[PDB]
Structure 1
Amino acid sequence: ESADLRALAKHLYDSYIKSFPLTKAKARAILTGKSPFVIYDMNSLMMGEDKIKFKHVAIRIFQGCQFRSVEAVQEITEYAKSIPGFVNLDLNDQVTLLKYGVHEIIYTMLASLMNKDGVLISEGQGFMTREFLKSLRKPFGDFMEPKFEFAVKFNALELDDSDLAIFIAVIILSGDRPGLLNVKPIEDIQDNLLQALELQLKLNHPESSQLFAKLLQKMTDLRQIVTEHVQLLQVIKKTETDMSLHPLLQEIYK
């Protein structure tokens, strides 16, 4: 029966490449060796915007992160709709799985762009450092540090795009999202996704023992930082006197 598990592994990987432009393999090449722009202080921030083409002082960084998250949701939605059985679910269930899922996949693939010294920005064309992300006014000065502590641990598992492709699918098909209407089949697809993930990590990582069990424990983490960032997204709602400009622009970021 593992013939179908190997089929599903490459089907999800091929769709992973089409839905996501900047893959982990191409981000690892940029982080080590061609070079992009480096934003390390306040001068290189303004210097960046000139020759980088952004699409939007301390709030300009956060608003750009929400612009990138909106583009990410579209890539995650298109990728999820290619998972076998996803589009054949209840349309309300598909909306719910994506609603409570995109935040966890955003940080999983964000780690693919992070090391211990910074993160890539604007499709690998730039690079914001770690210390510059702790030198902003509150509460911006400490909303990326939990995500850097997580990216260090998660990337230590040292997975590739084919492992991540299956791992992304399992997070979307989580059958415990509040408000589901047909919890059965969602757990059915996630059951075969977990089999394909268990098989994938054995054939690609034969030396690392219980990489499948250690990967599932990172989900326990993942949600703890998603629910922590959610409660931080309402500190920006109540603080800063510059987080409400064009009303049509507020509707996009929901």
Structure 2
Amino acid sequence: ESADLRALAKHLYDSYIKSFPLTKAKARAILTGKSPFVIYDMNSLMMGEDKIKFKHITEVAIRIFQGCQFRSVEAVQEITEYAKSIPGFVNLDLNDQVTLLKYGVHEIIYTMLASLMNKDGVLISEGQGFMTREFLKSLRKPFGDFMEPKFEFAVKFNALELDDSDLAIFIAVIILSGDRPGLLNVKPIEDIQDNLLQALELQLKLNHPESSQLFAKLLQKMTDLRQIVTEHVQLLQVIKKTETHPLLQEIYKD
């Protein structure tokens, strides 16, 4: 059994590597010791677009948001491709695959955004840029407080010092949550999650021997993830209520 959990851990890490171009290791390397272009106020953002070839650019506050929606839609596709490698996922009922992705992408998006944040800012644009936390906060209400709860989560989450090999298994666990509303067949889902939890537990024990109950502590963060998503939806229900193009709004439904 233990050899099997090592094998599963290795398979997931390989898939994560093929699926996510900017890994946590690569991001920490950029945030520590080339280097990214920095956006810290209104002036460095005008320059930042000249320089960085933004794929999302057709007012300041909404334009940064739309780019966050752009990259998030890109992230969905990366997570979806990763999910397919999780053993048993593709044998699940199709509707349930869709249901698991739909309710899980937001949680995985904020998990992986933390790999790319520190207390001072967040990498953007595949790490070519770095946008400070102060400039984000300084955005007019209600735009200057959607990334702030993200940062505060990332601070605490990053203090657990997970690497990519850890996150690969953790992300699979989130996807295989048997309590998403509207699932048809919870068995194989909760069955696969049991195997993944067993592998994450062994991974954390071998990779962080001195970090007692890191397994438990990481589980406790899934609580914080659910809380942030529900609070994010509440802001999304207002950016779709305060700020008011048909084809574009169709691409960025949800």
| Local SS of the residue matching 1:64 | helix
| Shift of residue 55, structure 1, vs aligned partner | 1.1
State the Cα deviation string for residues 211-247 of structure 1 (Å, max 9, x = none).
0000000000000000000011011111135xxxx21
SS of the aligned residue for 1:157 comes to coil
Distance in 2 (CA, whole Å) between partners of 1:155 and 1:131 is 19
Is residue 166 from structure 1 mapped to residue 169 from structure 2 by the alignment? yes
Deviation above 2 Å: which 4+ runs of structure 1?
none
Could you say which residue in structure 1 is the equivalent of 2:15? 15
Aligned equivalent of 1:81: 84
Q: Deviations over 1:12-58 (max 9, x none)?
A: 00000000000000000000112110000000001000011001211
Q: Quote the offset at 1:141 in angstroms.
A: 1.1
Distance 1:231 1:91 in 2: 29
Map 1:70-219 to 2 at 5 A: 70-219=73-222
CA apart distance, 1:138: 1.1
Structure 1 residue matching 2:7: 3-state secondary structure: helix
Alpha-carbon deviations, 1:53-92, whole Å to 9, x = none?
A: 0012110000000000000000000000110000000000
Alignment TM-score, normalising by the size of structure 2: 0.97
Q: Which moved more, 1:134-143 or 1:77-86?
A: 134-143
Q: How many Å separate the matches in 2 of 1:168 and 1:25?
A: 16
Paired with 2:142 and 2:209, the residues of 1 have a C-alpha distance of 43
Q: Over aligned residues, Cα RMSD in angstroms?
A: 0.6
Structure 1: give runs of 5+ residues left out of the alignment: none
Quote the Cα distance in structure 2 between the aligned partners of 1:7 and 1:229.
Answer: 36
SS in 2 for 1:127: strand
- Aligned mates of 2:147, 2:98 — CA distance in 1: 27
Instruction: Tell me, in whole angstroms, the C-alpha distance in 2 between the residues paired with 1:65 and 1:21.
Output: 17
Structure 1 residue 5: deviation in Å? Answer: 0.3
Could you report, residue by residue, the CA deviation over 1:111-163 in whole angstroms, capped at 9, with x for unpaired residues? 00000000000000000001001111110011111111100000000000000
Residue 169 of structure 1 deviates from its aligned partner by 0.1
- Percent identity over the alignment is 100
Q: Secondary structure at 1:230's aligned position in 2?
A: helix
Q: Which residue of 2 aligns with 1:232?
A: 235
Q: Which moved more, 1:71-80 or 1:134-143?
A: 134-143
Corresponding residue for residue 252 of structure 2: 253
User: How far apart in 1 are the matches of 2:147 and 2:177?
Assistant: 25
Deviations 1:180-226 (A, max 9, x none): 00011100000000000000000000011000000000000000000
CA distance in 1, matches of 2:217, 2:34: 34
Residue 223 of structure 1 corresponds to 226
**Structure 1 length-normalised TM:** 0.97
Secondary structure in structure 2 of the residue aligned to 1:120: strand
Which piece of structure 1 moves more, 231-240 or 156-165? 231-240
Structure 2: gaps spanning 5 or more residues: none
